[PDB]
């Protein structure tokens, strides 16, 4: 769709994303798969990912913020959408207006949300209650308070107790069941992320929340080792040589740098130039990376910096190890400046945020 | 202008940027100040920054890529624009069509570019030749090739040899090398070698344009430059979030995380919660950050993560030290998900990429 004018880009394999989504629905054929497309689908492009997943049966998405929900709605996503973070109470009408479900983290928040609803928006307010079941970050910890909140919701016909959830293990899961069994059960009961949806069946819940594994990565090497399914990595990060120089070794200049999310710490990494592992030398610049190459490498040759294979020296996890971080952040680092080139069979289309 | 629905954002002070720009033109009254707004003006937002700079006399911008240049043209920018990186030769008509000047890094590139020009685009191709004066990076290192490239340009009425440039005891040799190469051929209209450091520290009688980048935004390229200069620079960026929930030692939850550019390494940093220095504890998550806070801290309290002062424990340089990187990268890391709230006098307007 969009044009692009620099030879540096991500390939995003939508067939891989659909195939990983199908792993989850195949393994839990009686659960709603709430696809987590927060943070711009972990760097891949939430609008195009969410649209593709809807074309592959997805009916419920989760995002981190209301902006992320609205962005989906504005681009024709009609699926159910849950915001996982805490909406500012003043913005309540906007969530009601765009048919966006919200997370209830506390009784205080719910009381404030109610006070901010005017008569202007009159559609249902869909609510999922977040229980803190030990972990200790966002959510309601006491059963009594859980009951109070349900009672407040039932007071208002505009408010819907659509769901209840938590986030992680065995003891915590038991705590979740104990809290939830102390009250009427809502339509959606969910506690599993990617790891949970791969490791545990959890028959008590009727919906799951796979995030990173939809895009083809395990949340940890333990999960990768423990669970004997196959995920398809969806991302390649590619750049073409723009100039070669001899300075007894040839070097190649790539039009990509830390402003694209190829961080300075990548210096000393190896990248893939037509089959050859080539070291990244000298400082990674804002817009340029230098690679030590064999003498036959010329301007126009493609370089794989991130490859769509788990067992690869350019894999996301190896990139994460170089960055002293986790695969999640490597992907989130990839910046707006990179066109995303979506592959769906032999169909190819491009998002380029700079020309929107 | 734009609305936003999460209490995390950047304040961008356009008055500070205009003031820093004025520092450069005051230091160099006889030089064109080619304001570098590449990489979305180092995270500030290239459109809003370039528009503001044009309103304050700026007539020439430099960007990294043609996409960045067309982005400016699409938003009313009429100034000259130079692309500093290497355009794919097949896209040459697009640069010509949009009156964007291009960098010549090599003879080979130039011949490829000329081949791709359509008989039907007949506006000028404005060219700046990049010289490699000792860095062994982008551009022409040999005087004979430089002359050969000029002579090729002279053969085509459609092409203009508009400029020649390079990029920097180390730098004394390079400067002499630049003067020597340029003196061996006809001089073009624009001669330029100085970045922010070069512009703050050197005269360069020979050049007639400068290319300040990071210092336009209020940051020194190094402590050494900060110490040696007699000017003041005004930092232009704050990074702010509000507490969304507190839990009892009181902890505070912030709606910002590593997907926003506040990377996992920020764990153990201190932030400013209404005047109190407070430690980032536990893991920094994709969308959420946990801070140890005084008992009096409540939902809604504002927190400075990056402050607009050089001598602050939340300064961009301190943040860079925590990230084991440089100030440039800290800025570049700040993701599309954060609204930019522009300040210009008492005027305030918001850019929110997700709702664009
Ligand atoms: C991010 C998130 C998920 C998804 O986690 P992954 O490890 O990426 O699968 C699930 N639930 C909540 C509440 C989240 O915030
Ligand atoms: C980025 C850049 C500059 C400006 O560098 P700063 O240190 O940010 O001033 C100057 N010239 C070229 C070619 C650049 O790429």
Numbering used by the authors:
A (entry chain B): 2 to 169, 179 to 257, 274 to 382
B (entry chain A): 2 to 169, 177 to 256, 275 to 382
Which statements did the authors publish about this structure?
Alanine racemase (EC 5.1.1.1) is a pyridoxal-5′-phosphate (PLP) dependent enzyme which catalyzes the reversible racemization of l-alanine and d-alanine. As d-alanine is an essential component of the bacterial cell-wall peptidoglycan, inhibition of alanine racemase is lethal to those prokaryotic organisms that are dependent on this enzyme for d-alanine, thus making the enzyme an attractive antibiotic drug target. Structural studies of alanine racemase from bacteria such as Geobacillus stearothermophilus, Pseudomonas aeruginosa, Streptococcus lavendulae, Mycobacterium tuberculosis, Escherichia coli, Bacillus anthracis and Enterococcus faecalis indicate that the enzyme is a homodimer in its native con­formation. Each monomer has two domains: an α/β-barrel at the N-terminus and a C-terminal domain which is predominantly β-stranded.
The crystal structure of S. aureus alanine racemase (AlrSas), the sequence of which corresponds to that from the highly antibiotic-resistant Mu50 strain, has been solved to 2.15 Å resolution. The tertiary structure of S. aureus alanine racemase (AlrSas) is a homodimer comprised of two identical monomers, consistent with previous crystallographic studies of alanine racemases. Inspection of our X-ray structure revealed that the AlrSas homodimer has two active sites, both of which are comprised of residues from the N-terminal domain of one monomer and residues from the C-terminal domain of the second monomer. The essential PLP cofactor is covalently bound to the highly conserved catalytic lysine (Lys39) via an internal aldimine linkage and extends towards the centre of the α/β-barrel. In AlrSas the density for Lys131 is not consistent with carbamylation and in addition there is poor density for the side chain of Arg138, implying that this residue may be poorly ordered. Notably, in place of a carbamylated lysine the AlrSas structure contains a bound sulfate molecule. However, in the AlrSas structure, while it looks as if this sulfate is substituting for a carbamate or chloride ion at this position, it is likely to be too bulky and highly charged to do so effectively, which may offer an explanation as to why Arg138 is poorly ordered. In the structure of AlrSas there is one acetate, which is a weak inhibitor of alanine racemase, per active site. The carboxylate group of the AlrSas acetate forms a hydrogen bond to Met312′ NH, analogous to the interactions made by the carboxylate group of alanine.
